[PDB]
Write a protein that binds this ligand. Structure first.
Ligand SMILES: Nc1ncnc2c1ncn2[C@@H]1O[C@H](CSCC[C@H](N)C(=O)O)[C@@H](O)[C@H]1O
Length: 310
């Protein structure tokens, strides 16, 4: 069930892109275009998610002048590496982690499609990519098959791909931590904090899950054999912040997605709202109030990391 979320996320993102929510010429190479009608509330939610996460990544890249690493944990078919390259934003090295099966799928897409492999090769120090098995390693981009609940495997394979614990490092978990136990996600967060002197962590996932709407969401996901093993932490923005502060992080900010959406520039909101008609604002408000964007920093005072916002 948990691996299946990668496909769902990719399917939803490509669909939103096809309607014009944001620009992504790469996602087509990793997933088919869904053909059925969706709630516009869902597309707006995906846009807010992607925008918020992107804003935070770009703020980190500005503060570090791109002299840094990005590690995307549970990255699925994310295209952020290619989209950043196009914007002339390239970290020193960009790392992705997912289950071996998911990584195999992603490497197959890259190997089959020159629009994906070429940009990687352009920046590499060799005239070829070694992509056998569950690892792609290159100068500026690595994709690693590892179970995030096995921290020894995670660290070993990241270090095999020359992850440098001395660079300011941004770690991202976009709709990932909720699938592991509270102990497993806490251990991951603590591992990250212990590993890096100067760091930032972005967590996007559910929030306010104790109410009826949240209980219904949980059961709809348990109905598809996909348990929200970490949903306890999604009680509130407070429980989200506490998990960060109690596992080695120095700062913790969190916002629900409705507030984020309400704080978007007027131009972005007008553009977004132009794409599809939405009849009842309350379904939207409800959905947006049950997701959150959280970020934590440590050792960032010289870089001004605690000043980063969405
Ligand atoms: N224990 C674990 N180890 C490695 N990957 C995991 C994991 N638990 C969940 N994942 C991955 O987390 C992803 C959740 S779907 C979200 C994908 C991507 N971050 C996006 O936002 O578009 C899936 O690809 C799933 O395989």
């Amino acid at each position: 069930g948990v691996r299946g979320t990668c496909e769902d996320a990719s399917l939803c993102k490509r669909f939103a892109v096809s309607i014009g929510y944001w620009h992504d010429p790469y996602i087509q190479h990793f997933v088919r275009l869904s053909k059925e009608r969706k709630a516009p509330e869902i597309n707006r939610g995906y846009f807010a998610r992607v925008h918020g996460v992107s804003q935070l990544i770009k703020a980190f890249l500005r503060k570090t002048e791109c002299h840094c690493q990005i590690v995307n944990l549970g990255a699925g078919m994310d295209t952020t590496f290619w989209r950043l390259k196009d914007e002339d934003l390239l970290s020193s090295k960009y790392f992705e982690v997912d289950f071996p099966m998911i990584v195999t799928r992603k490497l197959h897409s890259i190997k089959c499609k020159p629009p994906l492999s070429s940009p990687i090769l352009e920046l590499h120090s060799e005239d070829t990519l070694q992509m056998d098995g569950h690892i792609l390693d290159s100068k500026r981009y690595a994709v690693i098959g590892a179970d995030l609940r096995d921290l020894s495997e995670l660290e070993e394979k990241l270090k095999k791909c020359n992850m440098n614990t001395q660079l300011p490092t941004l770690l991202i978990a976009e709709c990932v931590l909720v699938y592991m136990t509270p102990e497993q996600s806490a251990n991951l967060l603590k591992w990250a904090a212990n590993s890096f002197e100067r760091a930032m962590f972005i967590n996007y996932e559910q929030v306010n899950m104790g109410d009826r709407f949240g209980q219904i969401m949980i059961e709809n996901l348990r109905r598809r054999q996909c348990d929200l093993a970490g949903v306890e932490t999604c009680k509130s923005l407070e429980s989200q912040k506490e998990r960060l502060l109690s596992n080695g992080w120095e700062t913790a900010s969190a916002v629900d997605m409705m507030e984020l959406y309400n704080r978007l520039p007027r131009a972005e909101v007008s553009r977004i709202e132009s794409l599809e008609f939405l009849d009842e604002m309350e379904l939207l408000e409800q959905l947006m109030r049950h997701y959150c964007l959280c970020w934590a920093t440590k050792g960032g005072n010289e870089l001004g990391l605690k000043e980063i916002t969405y």
